[PDB]
Amino acid sequence: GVFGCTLQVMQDKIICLPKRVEMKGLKTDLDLQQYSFINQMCYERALHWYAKYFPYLVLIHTLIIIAYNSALVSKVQFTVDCNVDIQDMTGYKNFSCNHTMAHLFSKLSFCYLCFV
Amino acid sequence: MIGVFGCTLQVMQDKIICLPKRVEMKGLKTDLDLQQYSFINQMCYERALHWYAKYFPYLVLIHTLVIIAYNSALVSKVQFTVDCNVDIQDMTGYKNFSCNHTMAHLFSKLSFCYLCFVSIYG
Amino acid sequence: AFRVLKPWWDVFTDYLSVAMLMIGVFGCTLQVMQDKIICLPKRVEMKGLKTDLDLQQYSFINQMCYERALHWYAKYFPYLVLIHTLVFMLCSNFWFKFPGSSSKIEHFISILGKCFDSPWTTRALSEQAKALFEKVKKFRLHVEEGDILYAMYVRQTVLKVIKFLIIIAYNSALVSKVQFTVDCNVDIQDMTGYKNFSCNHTMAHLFSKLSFCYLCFVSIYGLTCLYTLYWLFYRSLREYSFEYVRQETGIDDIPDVKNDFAFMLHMIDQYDPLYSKRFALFLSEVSENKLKQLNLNNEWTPDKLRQKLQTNAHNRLELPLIMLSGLPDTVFEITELQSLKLEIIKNVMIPATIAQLDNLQELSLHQCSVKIHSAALSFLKENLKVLSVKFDDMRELPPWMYGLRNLEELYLVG
Amino acid sequence: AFRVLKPWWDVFTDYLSVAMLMIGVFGCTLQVMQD
């Protein structure tokens, strides 16, 4: 769980965009900041707390597992959606997001389950 | 060790993001540069955020060098999101702002583990 | 060298100074890292309020209103803390960094180390320390003229007190001066197009709180000084008289020491009274006499005295002595000797161990000062038959020889 | 050998020299970093 924690603190950053709207560009005319805000919002809300705590959970347990870890590995995925009411804050409601480390833990989690 | 860790990231990433609150769907372009936004970060960080929250990395450090009565009721004080009606009108064109910071949920979970550590010690 | 010289209040002050340095270095580190003012032009449903200024003018305004508006004390506070901490360190360590007194301090620490390390201290309270008694006496005659070390320490404490007073005085007023926000009217209009500005910097409130705790620390430091002030201005430490060792080992000597020695004895007592008790003996005159007797008994031994023996003029097994400073015990272990010869041997005490020399009938005395104890004197009164005595200035002549009732022949010269 | 050769003024000058050296190195650090 130590290795996942290092990636969680440093590398685990989520990127987000608003979903609801020759192919032209799709200028969303929002600057960097509320983009970071939306990153935080859909990081806290949509991202599953087990996944957020997964680097911590392995660290805590290393220092019943099969019953609930089996379902929560399939619970997490690469992409994510979230309908959080940032309307009147940025004017958008439904967002798509993805965080960089999603598939890596999915490969890492499956091998970790075999050990236990 | 917990006290230094909290102070370490507080120097690094204790940053609160802020937006002016009150205003198919489109963008909400605000036409404010990063300068005003850092200014608003400072202002609402000072005003809205609770004092114990800001000094949480320092309260832990001082107590280690030298709890349950007040910190138990102070855990519910820290919130993920937060709001501020700061009189920054005629300064940036807004009055109300919604803000929050990465450390909000981090400290709440960090406080939960620390409150256990003090309990076993006492 | 650096340990037995520190009273508890001194160690507390030293660790307070360490905390001072830590506070200061943390403050200066934060100032160098993240001390940034942020500024905006002041006097301008609600919409945006774009100011059409690129980043560079923003930095320039930051610098300008940081220098002008933000108070100089708010900026310099960590650096002030560093300078005051360093001056405190210097004024604390100057007591030992001045070589003139440092040499005396070094010799003092060394002699007490050798003294409480000496087993003969315990032996006298219940060999080579004899050679250390002269070091003790030379140092004690050396530093009775001083007391300037005490005055220098007092002046150091006074300087600490005065600087404390000034620091607390001005900081009490200047804590309120710092503020989170600030307004500046800088005549930068028509060069950047604005004159009124609102600014605030990250450090401000933090420093306030930091300042507060810092002040508290300084305050307790001052209390330490206050303690020493009582310790300086009520005990009258210019004179030291044991009156305890004199009562516990029954030694009427070691009456007093001068102001410098009084003070250093006091400091040792504050550190460890047991070390003062251990060091007390190397000054006793009677203990010095006992150590002289001990070394004398050790180095003159019974085989040596048996070899020295012979027959005198009056056909008696005699142990002639020509150079001595006392009476060896092994001399009294050879009971078969019948006579004794002494030349230039002063400070002589005859113990009742001469009564061990039961077959004693002649004695030869030549220019020696001899005092007998009452039991030994009675033994000689009931045992002497012949005597030889020589006196130059009537001093070596003993009066007690006028008490021996059984003397037959007395030989005198001079 | 290395101590008894330093009168009081010599030691005080040495301390002043050390203080000046740290002042100078601090100034150079500030110039390279923030100036």
Author numbering:
A (entry chain G): 39 to 59, 95 to 136, 275 to 327
B (entry chain A): 37 to 59, 95 to 137, 276 to 331
C (entry chain B): 16 to 59, 95 to 176, 236 to 523
D (entry chain C): 16 to 50
Give the text the authors published on this PDB structure.
The female patient carried a different monoallelic variant in LRRC8C, NM_032270.4:c.1168 G>C, p.(Val390Leu) (NC_000001.11:g.89713738 G>C [hg38], NC_000001.10:g.90179297 G>C [hg19]), or LRRC8CV390L, which also occurred in a de novo manner. In P1, the insertion of a base yields a frameshift in the amino acid sequence leading to a truncated protein, whereas the replacement of a valine by a leucine at position 390 leads to a moderate increase of the side chain volume without altering the hydrophobic character of the position. To investigate the biochemical properties of LRRC8C constructs carrying the disease variants, we compared the elution properties of overexpressed and purified WT and mutated human LRRC8C subunits as fusion to green fluorescent protein in HEK293 cells and found LRRC8CWT and LRRC8CV390L to elute as monodisperse peaks at the same volume, indicating that the presence of the point variant did not interfere with folding and oligomerization. Even though less pronounced than in LRRC8Ctrunc, related features in the map of LRRC8CV390L indicate a similarly increased subunit mobility. Akin to the truncated construct, also in case of the missense change, the ESD region is the best-defined part of the structure, obeying C7 symmetry and closely resembling WT. Despite the distinct difference between the two genetic variants, one (LRRC8CV390L) resulting in a conservative replacement of amino acid, the second (LRRC8Ctrunc) in the loss of an entire protein domain (representing ~50% of the protein), their structural and functional consequences are similar, leading to a strong increase of the subunit mobility in an oligomeric assembly and in consequence to a pronounced increase of activity even under isotonic conditions where VRACs are usually closed.
Volume-regulated anion channels (VRACs) constitute a diverse family of ion channels that are ubiquitously expressed in mammalian cells. They are believed to be essential for maintaining cellular volume, as they are known to open in response to hypotonic stress, enabling efflux of anions and osmolytes, thereby preventing excessive cell swelling and burst. VRACs are hexamers composed of five closely related paralogues of the leucine-rich repeat-containing protein 8 family (termed LRRC8A to E). In contrast, when expressed on its own, the LRRC8C subunit forms a larger, heptameric assembly with weaker mutual subunit interactions and a different preferential arrangement of the LRRDs.
